């Protein structure tokens, strides 16, 4: 469960948040495969509540009506088509599996659902699965409200409703089997693995019992005996009875400390400095690298209400965001996920974005296609961070240096730092308020290297900055503190 099952030499996945299946299929072929992306985390493919107040929020997809693969992203035919086309170009699909719960207990009964399935939250009736009152934790939860009130009680965090979401009884073999049925449907279609949504709210043993029922991966694309990649979403910043490590038997865990701390460092908040990053990784008390799924932001905390708070860097913060993402992609710790977002009318009041609910770009609820601009960015308010040159080229950096050790660290004691990956890559950051001009040991073979942050290597040329590595491995780096992108990256495949 710990291996991503990506093609050899592909080291990242991208979250194409709220994208339609037909757009993801195209994206695999026209971009992700040639640019060396390992795979795609897709939004939940299963039927969800259609929530009209507010109007079609992104979070409606985290309230299941059934396991039909029928959503605003597409139907089962389109989903199957996407997984096939993506796998055929060597780009994997990971499903966001929402298995802890069905919808909100207060949602009105009816057919307001993305496939038109009937459901009745009040009577605990989801006939399209089918689930009934026997399949939920109503009796088991011991809190007064029936909802999670106290994170110091590990039992209620598992057995009670998260913000009132009907909590499935995952101890029951019937419920475990219905979930496995859904997941095996997806595996046989060809998905490579799963994000297990709200894993903190499930018992590690119930998750295991579900995973125990799963098929090996589709043998047309994956070697026999291949198991689905599992990454469990657990937000653990410490100090609670439930720890990320409790889930290690099932797969990897989301390390939410990673982006919280990195955001604080790059913002230079709370006295933190980039020079402190020298021991980044387990030295900062994160989970073991081989159990970590890392990221700068995710779909929830890029809206500022997550863990931790306002320190999270997002596309809105583009200059510092590119630096943080670049540091993450260069550093060997963890398996990396790149966010890809849509724009929404962010409106702050009282420290809160009142529009943080807004769903994907849409015409009266129909999600807009991803359009590609001549410069290869996206239109229709899709941000497409994964197509930003500075991010995409660092995705490739990480492929190029795969396996190479963290080495040749430099820091100035404040915010100017640099490091290499073996003899395959080197990266330099200036986050201080003065210029960085210094000669550093890059660990690289002598030659002329294209800086892949400012430009690209094309046809024996660089379109950006050129770095000159002498025969002793040393190169001069000049970075103004006022630079558009105050970091430089070079690697074996950017050499002329």
**Residues 292-331: x where in contact with Cl ion by CB under 5 A, - otherwise, as a string:** ------x---------------------------------
Per the structure block, which two tokens stand in for 76?
């089962």
Q: Which residues contact 26 (CB under 8 A, 6 or more apart)?
A: 370
How many residues touch Ca ion under the rule CB under 5 A: the total is 4
**CA angle 474-36-228, nearest 5°?**
120
- Got the DSSP string for 32-53? ITTTT--EEEEPP-S-BB--TT
Our answer to whether residue 233 is catalytic in this structure is: yes
Q: Is 124 annotated as a binding residue?
A: no
* Min separation Cβ 37 and Cl ion, Å: 18
* Min separation Cβ 233 and Cl ion, Å: 5
- Per the DSSP assignment, residues forming a β-bridge with 101 are 167
Q: Which residues contact 59 (CB under 8 A, 6 or more apart)?
A: 357
Per the structure block, which two tokens stand in for 26?
């195209």
Nearest to 246 by CA among 291, 298, 307, 212: 291
Which residues between 150 and 169 bind Ca ion (CB under 5 A)? 158, 167
Q: Which does 246 bind (CB under 5 to 8 A by kind): Cl ion, Ca ion, none?
A: none
Q: Is 201 annotated as a binding residue?
A: yes
Which helix (H) or strand (E) element contains residue 420?
strand 416-421
Residue sitting closest to Cl ion (CB)? 298
Q: Which does 201 bind (CB under 5 to 8 A by kind): Ca ion, Cl ion, none?
A: Ca ion
Q: Is 485 annotated as a binding residue?
A: no
Dihedral angle of Cα 283, 284, 286, 288, to the nearest 10 degrees: -10
* Min separation Cβ 111 and Cl ion, Å: 30
How many residues touch Cl ion under the rule CB under 5 A: the total is 3
- The residue within the footprint of Cl ion, chosen from 27, 78, 135, 233 (CB under 5 A), is 233
**CA angle 412-413-416, nearest 5°?**
45
The residue (of 201 and 261) whose beta carbon lies closer to Ca ion is 201
**Quick one: which segment of 35-43, 184-192, 229-237, 268-276 binds Cl ion (CB under 5 A)?**
229-237
Integer CA distances (angstroms), 229 to 93, 147, 232, 256, 478, in order: 10, 31, 10, 19, 42
Measured from the Cβ of residue 269, the count of other Cβ atoms closer than 10 Å reads 11
Q: Which does 298 bind (CB under 5 to 8 A by kind): Cl ion, Ca ion, none?
A: Cl ion
Q: Which does 291 bind (CB under 5 to 8 A by kind): Cl ion, Ca ion, none?
A: none
* Min separation Cβ 422 and Cl ion, Å: 30
Q: Which does 233 bind (CB under 5 to 8 A by kind): Ca ion, Cl ion, none?
A: Cl ion
Q: Which residues contact 482 (CB under 8 A, 6 or more apart)?
A: none
The residues of the shown chain that bind Ca ion, judged by CB under 5 A, are 100, 158, 167, 201
- List binding-site positions: 100, 158, 167, 195, 201, 298, 337
Catalytic residues: 197, 233
Binding residues for chloride: 195, 298, 337
Residues that bind Cl ion (CB under 5 A): 233, 254, 298
């Amino acid at each position: 469960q710990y291996s991503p099952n990506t093609q050899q030499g592909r080291t990242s996945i991208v979250h194409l948040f709220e994208w339609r299946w037909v757009d993801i299929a195209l994206e695999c072929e026209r971009y992700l495969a040639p640019k060396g992306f390992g795979g795609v985390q897709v939004s939940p493919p299963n039927e969800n509540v259609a929530i009209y107040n507010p109007f079609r929020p992104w979070w409606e997809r985290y309230q299941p009506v059934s396991y039909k693969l029928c959503t605003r992203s597409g139907n089962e035919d389109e989903f199957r088509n996407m997984v096939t086309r993506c796998n055929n170009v060597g780009v994997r699909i990971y499903v966001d599996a929402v298995i802890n719960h069905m919808c909100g207990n207060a949602v009105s009964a009816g057919t307001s659902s993305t496939c038109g399935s009937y459901f009745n939250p009040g009577s605990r009736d989801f006939p399209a699965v089918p689930y009934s009152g026997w399949d939920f934790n109503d009796g088991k939860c011991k809190t007064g409200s029936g909802d999670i009130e106290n994170y110091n009680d590990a039992t209620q965090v598992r057995d009670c409703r998260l913000t009132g979401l009907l909590d499935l009884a995952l101890e029951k073999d019937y419920v475990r089997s219905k979930i496995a049925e859904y997941m095996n449907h997806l595996i046989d279609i060809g998905v490579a693995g799963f994000r297990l949504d709200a894993s903190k709210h499930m018992w590690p043993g119930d998750i295991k019992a579900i995973l125990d029922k799963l098929h090996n991966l589709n043998s047309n694309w994956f070697p026999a005996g291949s198991k689905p990649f599992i990454y469990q979403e657990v937000i653990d910043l410490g100090g609670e009875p439930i720890k990320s490590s409790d889930y290690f038997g099932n797969g990897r865990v989301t390390e939410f400390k990673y982006g919280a701390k990195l955001g604080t460092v790059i913002r230079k908040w709370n006295g933190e400095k980039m020079s402190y990053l020298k021991n980044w990784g387990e030295g900062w008390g994160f989970v073991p690298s081989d159990r970590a799924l890392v990221f700068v932001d995710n779909h929830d905390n890029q809206r500022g209400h997550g863990a931790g708070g306002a320190s999270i860097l997002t596309f809105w913060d583009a200059r510092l965001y590119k630096m943080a993402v670049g540091f993450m992609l260069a550093h060997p710790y963890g398996f990396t996920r790149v966010m890809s977002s849509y724009r929404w009318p962010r409106q702050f009041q009282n420290g809160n974005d009142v529009n943080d609910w807004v769903g994907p770009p849409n015409n009266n609820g129909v999600i807009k296609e991803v359009t590609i601009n001549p410069d290869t960015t996206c239109g229709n308010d899709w941000v497409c961070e994964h197509r930003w040159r500075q991010i995409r080229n660092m995705v490739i950096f990480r492929n190029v240096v795969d396996g190479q050790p963290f080495t040749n660290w430099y820091d100035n004691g404040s915010n100017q730092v640099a490091f290499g990956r073996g003899n395959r890559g080197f990266i330099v950051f200036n986050n201080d308020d003065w210029s960085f001009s210094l000669t550093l040991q890059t660990g690289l073979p002598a030659g002329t290297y294209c800086d892949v942050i400012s430009g690209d290597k094309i046809n024996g040329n660089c379109t950006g900055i050129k770095i000159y590595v002498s025969d002793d491995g040393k190169a001069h780096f000049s970075i103004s503190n006022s630079a558009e992108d105050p970091f430089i990256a070079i690697h074996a495949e950017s050499k002329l």
